[PDB]
A = this chain, B = another copy of it.
């Protein structure tokens, strides 16, 4: 017998270009149905939805037993029609990267995707919960998704209340995203930003029985991606900025680029659902 998923649903939406998206939604587990939810609730939108929906859903459900639980929120995972894999490399390359003059073909569709989230996904989800009003909205993404979250903050800060950038791919075009950050701070209720990374991303330890050639290759890749220091450079630029209410930065000790996803999505939704508004930075 297959495993049923309670208090959740999925449906397909097409963007204005006719490209399909899998929208997966879940809500607090104790609810008899969607209509039992009344009043203001927070909502989190998670890009690369197929990779993270289940963990976000279940982590949110685990909060019901926690002392600091406030009522929870709605999880929305924005993904792709997939079988046997968690990512759509072609689709996400366009959807999650900002437009640049030097970007290769199939990149630079972040604003098209952000428009799709605001104009199609958000109303579609709102229509599933007519009694519920949206108290606040968070955008979560990891890697290229984290780059998207930062791009959204710097170019359309009013779009979401909270931006959660897990291990953001600042390396993809550091000149681009850091120029956008510089333009953001130098320009005249502010949103909040959570930035995180794993401590093994830039400084990976050697595995047991790992050959030296293989390890030096991993170390060189890690140095080029520069995950921790690019994130710290960005957070330094944003320090003392009036256009940001709070900036929370977190290095997860002992986590790599993949493993940190469990930590960051769980803490991201938990803090957004239970610790809002954040303390002023």
A residues at B contact (CB < 8 Å): 1-6, 8-11, 24, 26, 29-32, 51-55, 57-59, 61-68, 83-87, 207-208, 218, 250, 253-254, 256-259, 261-263, 266-267, 270, 275, 277, 279
Nearest CB in chain B: distance from A132 CB, A: 19
For A275, list chain B residues within 8 Å (CB).
Answer: 207-208
For A261, list chain B residues within 8 Å (CB).
Answer: 59, 62
Contact A86 B61, beta carbon cutoff 8 Å: yes
Contact A30 B84, beta carbon cutoff 8 Å: yes
For A279, list chain B residues within 8 Å (CB).
Answer: 208
For A85, list chain B residues within 8 Å (CB).
Answer: 29-30, 64
Contacts A5-B3, A10-B2, A84-B29: A262 and B263 contacting too (C-beta < 8 A)? yes
Contacts A66-B256, A67-B218, A258-B63: A6 and B54 contacting too (C-beta < 8 A)? no
Contact A267 B259, beta carbon cutoff 8 Å: yes
For A6, list chain B residues within 8 Å (CB).
Answer: 83-84
Please give 6 more A-B residue pairs, beta carbons under 8 A apart, in addition to A29-B86, A55-B55.
Answer: A31-B84, A54-B57, A55-B262, A207-B275, A208-B275, A262-B262
- State which of B8, B63, B68 has its C-beta within 8 Å of the C-beta of A2: B8
